[PDB]
Copies of this chain bind each other. A is one copy, B any other.
Amino acid sequence: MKTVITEVIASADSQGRFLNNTELQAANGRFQRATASMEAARALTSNADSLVKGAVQEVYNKFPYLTQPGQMGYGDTNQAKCARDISHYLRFITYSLVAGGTGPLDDYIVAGLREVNRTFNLSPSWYIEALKHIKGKVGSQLSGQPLTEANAYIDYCINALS
């Protein structure tokens, strides 16, 4: 799973090489950034329920036809899967924050994303809109480098979905 630390190890290993000062300075960058990252993760974890609820409701505000009979935002099961999915994204964002890299998102959401969404008729636009709403809300919960960290991973997702 991709983190700064697995990445620098992969680098040294691809060259049959002991880790040197090149890779250790890199690793220090991961460790120095951890405090800001963990502060972001903590804020997203503790506001998770309301961040998910609001995001799901913003999807239905943006695409109102979804909540009509026959549509994919209609019924308890469709709506429960939405909340679950948006909870997944937020969970994997917190993981990436704590991990020091995009690996959790890459491995659990991004690999297979379009194949899966195509087969189950899931529009990336719904998830992009959910994530933009979460981004708006996180902007009042965090500032400074914790905000920069959170935004990086939220934007990463939005891009993966585009």
A residues near B (Cβ < 8 Å) are 2-4, 7-8, 10-11, 18, 20-33, 63-65, 96, 100-103, 114, 118, 121, 123-125, 149, 152-153, 156, 159, 162
Contacts and interface: CB of A to CB of B under 8 A. Distances in A.
B21 A101 contact: yes
A30 B25 contact: yes
A63 B125 CA distance: 15
Contacts of A153: 21
Contacts of A124: 118
Contacts of A20: 101-102, 152, 156
B162 A102 contact: no
B21 A26 contact: no
Specify which of A64, A114, A152 lies most central, judged by the most chain B CB atoms within 10 Å of its CB. Answer: A152
A32 B30 contact: no
A26 B2 contact: no
Specify which of A4, A24, A96, A159 lies most central, judged by the most chain B CB atoms within 10 Å of its CB. Answer: A4
